[PDB]
Amino acid sequence: ATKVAVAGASGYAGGEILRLLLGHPAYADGRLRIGALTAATSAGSTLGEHHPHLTPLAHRVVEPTEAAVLGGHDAVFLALPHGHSAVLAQQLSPETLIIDCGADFRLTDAAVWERFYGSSHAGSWPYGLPELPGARDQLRGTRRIAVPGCYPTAALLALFPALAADLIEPAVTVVAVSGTSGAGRAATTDLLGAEVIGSARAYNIAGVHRHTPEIAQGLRAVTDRDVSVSFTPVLIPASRGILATCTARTRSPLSQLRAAYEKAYHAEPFIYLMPEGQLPRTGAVIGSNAAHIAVAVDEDAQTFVAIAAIDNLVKGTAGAAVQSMNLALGWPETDGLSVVGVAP
Amino acid sequence: ATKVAVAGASGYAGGEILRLLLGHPAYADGRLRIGALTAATSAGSTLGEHHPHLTPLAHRVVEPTEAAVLGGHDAVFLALPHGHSAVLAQQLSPETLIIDCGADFRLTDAAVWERFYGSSHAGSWPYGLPELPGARDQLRGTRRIAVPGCYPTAALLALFPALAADLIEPAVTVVAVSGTSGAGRAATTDLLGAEVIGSARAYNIAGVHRHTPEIAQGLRAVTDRDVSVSFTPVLIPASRGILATCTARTRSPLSQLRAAYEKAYHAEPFIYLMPEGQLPRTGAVIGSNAAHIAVAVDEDAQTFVAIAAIDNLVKGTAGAAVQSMNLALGWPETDGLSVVGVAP
Amino acid sequence: ATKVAVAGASGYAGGEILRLLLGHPAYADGRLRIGALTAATSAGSTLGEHHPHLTPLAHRVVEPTEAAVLGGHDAVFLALPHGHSAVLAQQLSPETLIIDCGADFRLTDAAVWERFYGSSHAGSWPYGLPELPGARDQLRGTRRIAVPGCYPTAALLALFPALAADLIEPAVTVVAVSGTSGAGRAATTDLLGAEVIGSARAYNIAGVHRHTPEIAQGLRAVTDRDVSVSFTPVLIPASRGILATCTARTRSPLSQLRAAYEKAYHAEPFIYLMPEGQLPRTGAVIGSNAAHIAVAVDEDAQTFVAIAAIDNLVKGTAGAAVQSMNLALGWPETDGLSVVGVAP
Amino acid sequence: ATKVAVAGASGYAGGEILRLLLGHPAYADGRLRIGALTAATSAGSTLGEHHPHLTPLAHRVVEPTEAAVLGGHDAVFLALPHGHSAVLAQQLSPETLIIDCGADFRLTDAAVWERFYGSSHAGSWPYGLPELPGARDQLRGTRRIAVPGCYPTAALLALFPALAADLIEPAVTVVAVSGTSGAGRAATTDLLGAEVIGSARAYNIAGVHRHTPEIAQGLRAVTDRDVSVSFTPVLIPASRGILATCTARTRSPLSQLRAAYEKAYHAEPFIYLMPEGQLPRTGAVIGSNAAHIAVAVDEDAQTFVAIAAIDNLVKGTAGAAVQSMNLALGWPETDGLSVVGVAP
Ligand SMILES: NC(=O)c1ccc[n+]([C@@H]2O[C@H](COP(=O)([O-])OP(=O)(O)OC[C@H]3O[C@@H](n4cnc5c(N)ncnc54)[C@H](OP(=O)(O)O)[C@@H]3O)[C@@H](O)[C@H]2O)c1
Ligand SMILES: NC(=O)c1ccc[n+]([C@@H]2O[C@H](COP(=O)([O-])OP(=O)(O)OC[C@H]3O[C@@H](n4cnc5c(N)ncnc54)[C@H](OP(=O)(O)O)[C@@H]3O)[C@@H](O)[C@H]2O)c1
Ligand SMILES: COc1ccc2[nH]cc(CC(=O)O)c2c1
Ligand SMILES: COc1ccc2[nH]cc(CC(=O)O)c2c1
Ligand SMILES: COc1ccc2[nH]cc(CC(=O)O)c2c1
Ligand SMILES: COc1ccc2[nH]cc(CC(=O)O)c2c1
């Protein structure tokens, strides 16, 4: 039996983890039990007040986020803002599996963490991107997992096959558009529907976004060159979805690149290379754990270009948390995680 | 090994049926296989060229909609425009399970079919609304099913308990808002995203809309009274969803009306009537076969109010279709049919 | 040269008064100047931090809302829609023209006010709905205006001609779909883009909505009979717009009804009657002071149907404010108000 | 009094042109008169059936697009489907001012035109982008105007000052998100409401887009060096808007770059630099002829970043046309083109 808690269940990330715990085959056959669901200000309320789409768990009472509530669980999902997984994992048994969606344990460079996040660095856990060279090995059987950010996921998948193959220059440029739900359920004026509907805006530009160094970190894991990352995230009128455009100087032929991408991904269950003439679209991956990827070559401009479409709440967080949890617990990697997206 | 065919596979209802089949527990242990996938002018093309979310069936070539093609399939789903299933049915073998998403076999009065469809009445098949009184027994083991339209499913599910209780009057009004997908994939110009985004409009008003008599028909099955229907559809900037507001004169206490809906729906797997103080929203049901329902009384205006939310492609078309296929084959009714919406 | 202040210049209604003044002919030829722009919080900040669409005023420094700062203005807009403003009005000299966007002074029945608001009734001022019978003559030269609510502008305009000609029954049904901008700038989670995008929901149903008596009041102004109102508001992924489906039982012919609406509107320059075979859509009036109206008869249901579309921040709020202000000052009524929408 | 004819009056470009003239001061006093409104297939329709938002022109009868009809007008706008306007162009009088929104007369290099347009090159007319250096001078008194593409307008105003100041390296990247209207009014199934809503997708990537050569061109006009452009457009669920993110390497301080954009843009009425700490957004410029630019520097990436927002129908097409018509006829450059957009 595997009893699972979720800290921050009243937020988007937590809702997305529960939808999938609901659909997990380990749930339907009882090898998985949904234990405690906690929050902060919303403790004492029913979950239907927050997640009216998770009707099976609507009667559940949101408990306070305390080590005393979260003890006695084999697995413990952390879907709260960064800074809390530090203290909170220090309070649980060593053998319980902790899956943190925050950024606390993502970066390996303490000085980068302080420059970008503005707090002390808690260290690093295995990185919940199984598709990354070497990462899958490190998830198998572990008990501490750090889920990647929603932007670094789309980009690394897009870029790492070419940079590891040495078919593109190590200075990359990423311009991603995201749906609103990647900002989180905290009520801020600038994420009101009246404001995002019919309006696009780029934010945190010129390399100040905290995901800039996360993409950098991962690409440096496939190369020995100096890596450079111009990241620019763009907010568009959508609830979910991440469409990441990724360019970098190349002199290799599209022949060689397309072959580079088939090798790295032909056996990946979740990565789907588009047929020629096709190009990813976010709307086709919504609600699925899949990533759609097209590669091309702008030879007039000696520019490689590669597009990834991922759902930011699944492959971008909760799907990667569940996928990492399948590996940590030794269950089939795809348990609970469909590749069939909900469309239109 | 139930071998299934889907005529009109490249349509919205066709892809939603296929999406659902791909997640059916029968497909997973092979008691179900996906067979011919047929269309009209898009025959010869691949399915991924139409449904990029259905990557497991993207390599499939869609064949023409011909008896030779459809034959030798135990179940055939027909997702064509009307005027086609009438002849396709005697052409197929009598023992195949035929399920028409269209309207050709929905209605039971020939004067009404002519008055609204301009063609000859085809007659009548069992109606795909298992929750309607007496429907389940008619579906168990039939081999011919007409699936309800999206709007009648909403209106009926919202009104009939209080009308079968004789607690409201039989002159109901329904104003249902709906996403764009119910209009289907045919490229009209007032369904272009530029004219749909940021605009709402009512169409087919004053009771010329073909769903009006279908609702009238469904409501007449639970009352001996003379029923009248004012029905108004209003298209809104959304890809999925149907919010149906239905009002009727009543002088019954709220308590008795509430009781009549709990008696009607407590044991119903896909019908979830909201806690007191919550109200349905479409986003809560999307991707899922649920209907979220709420009732209230406008004491001043002496008016009952029922609100209903259903996904227009799942519970209004393919979910009902698959739900009735489960019944016609004697499979657990909820198989492949989730009550958990994809939200936000 | 009339000085103009705007109390609550940072919210939506406030920003849309300024947009309209910015493009008002008196503002161009010096007759009109734009004085103090106050707010509760966010005072000390620039207006461009709030309305980056109003670049000309971007430098302006938002001030506190006090009788001090508001004193010394020929006209003062109280843009805290459906809030409170009675206290401010008593700290201003009676010679100052005050146009209140909120509902403090709309209602004519203290008992109804207390019942629906829980406050002491401030009393009543001329209703800013010029097309209403008798409304325009009470605005001419007035020093106190109450701008009507977004929904009752739509419903009154749709319904009163039929009602006044005694061609429909006084028990009416109105269902209105509306964009998120009517909820205001008030930060709240149920109004986040991720929430609103992709979903619809009726809220505040079955009599509880505060515009219900506002609709009753306007109708009782054109009939001596007792009027009930079933009003249902519905949220939709739009930022602006109000499409109101309004119904009442009738026995009068289509021709009698269509004539009544042309007798009432051929002179009114903001009401455009749809040609035979057309229907309102909100997309066609956005950013405009127009109301687009169509009428029909469901003969089977014995039901009148009227559809009206307006912009919820223009003809529904700021447009009514300015249109009435023009009249208050003896300026031409159409000054600065276009009937042409920015579409698609 | 200048008689004007719009050809393509039934399409998005056409109706936005007509919205502008209706608001034009030259229309209000009589120096401008709206004449024949023609379409390719819509002849015999009234204009309201196409543009319900231009109610003042609703009664106009759409005529066929033939030289006989278009003759007798001083100015003639050509909003004809993406090209094939050169025929019509030589069939009108040579003293008749024609503004072409198509692309047939934009390009300079016949070799580049054939490569991207598969057709023989018709020649080049003065580009209708006054902010481009030396461009305003060739528009004064012109009788041949080619309006820029929606995308080049953005990228050029985003990039040209820094390239002209020789501050950035002339290999530039552009990844622009855009609403659906820019694709025009032709009904594909890929522009269907259901499909663009909730989905992003890059299209025509890796240098196949016909705006890439138009971007290279304008940039070639401000520099000695050879310019290569990497242009990615991305469709988003919006109706109007373009948000162009443009990068290139730079070896300058942010200070020099801002000092170049202030130098270029302090005197141009429609180009709005953002206050330090503010970044552009599309919802702010919608319905106006404005363009909001901001520049930054990612020092660790040695990258210059310029963000530009414009309304794709106004500054991107129909506004540019009207603006260039003002210069053509010797009227003030801002006549009929506000800088204040319609938001939220
Ligand atoms: N959203 C995404 O797409 C995404 C992608 C990748 C990673 N993540 C990560 O997932 C985590 C959750 O973000 P979100 O998008 O879900 O935001 P959210 O919707 O607003 O919810 C965040 C959750 O954190 C809880 N919480 C806040 N402060 C807390 C505190 N002191 N103690 C305990 N619980 C607290 C909240 O409970 P209350 O209701 O009581 O406030 C809430 O349930 C973040 O760390 C994020 O980095 C998110
Ligand atoms: N979509 C909904 O929300 C919904 C809900 C409830 C019920 N329904 C019903 O489901 C049915 C399907 O409509 P839809 O929404 O899916 O619209 P749609 O997207 O246009 O689908 C139409 C499908 O039927 C095929 N088709 C068209 N004409 C054909 C012909 N002569 N012969 C054979 N195949 C033909 C088309 O193939 P080609 O590509 O070759 O043209 C296409 O695959 C309708 O009758 C509808 O009333 C729909
Ligand atoms: C707060 O602005 C937003 C809006 C949408 C978003 N989608 C994904 C993110 C990641 C992040 O910046 O945290 C994000 C941020
Ligand atoms: C015609 O535009 C629309 C928009 C949304 C819709 N949902 C369902 C339908 C068709 C119908 O079932 O009548 C429909 C049509
Ligand atoms: C969710 O709350 C909303 C949403 C949209 C709206 N449009 C107009 C209003 C006024 C009101 O309902 O009080 C409104 C309120
Ligand atoms: C072709 O699909 C699209 C979708 C959205 C668009 N917005 C602007 C354009 C102009 C262009 O690319 O020609 C466009 C095209």
Residue numbers in the entry:
A (entry chain C), B (entry chain D), C (entry chain A), D (entry chain B): 9 to 352
Q: What's in the article?
A:
The arginine biosynthesis pathway consists of eight different enzymes ([Fig fig1]) all considered to be essential for *M. tuberculosis* growth *in vitro*. In conclusion, using a fragment-based approach, we have discovered inhibitors that bind to novel sites in ArgB and ArgF and to the active sites of ArgC and ArgD, which in case of ArgB show on target activity against *M. tuberculosis*.
Enzymatic assays revealed that 2 mM NMR322 inhibited ArgC activity by 45% whereas 2 mM NMR571 caused a 37% inhibition. Although the thermal shifts obtained for NADP(H)-binding pocket fragments NMR401 and NMR863 were higher than those for substrate-binding pocket fragments NMR322 and NMR571, the SPR binding response for the latter was better and positively correlated with percentage inhibition of enzymatic activity (**[Table tbl2]**). Our results further show that in the case of ArgC there are two possible strategies to develop inhibitors, with one targeting the cofactor binding site and the other the substrate binding site. It is not clear at this point which strategy has the highest potential to result in potent inhibitors.
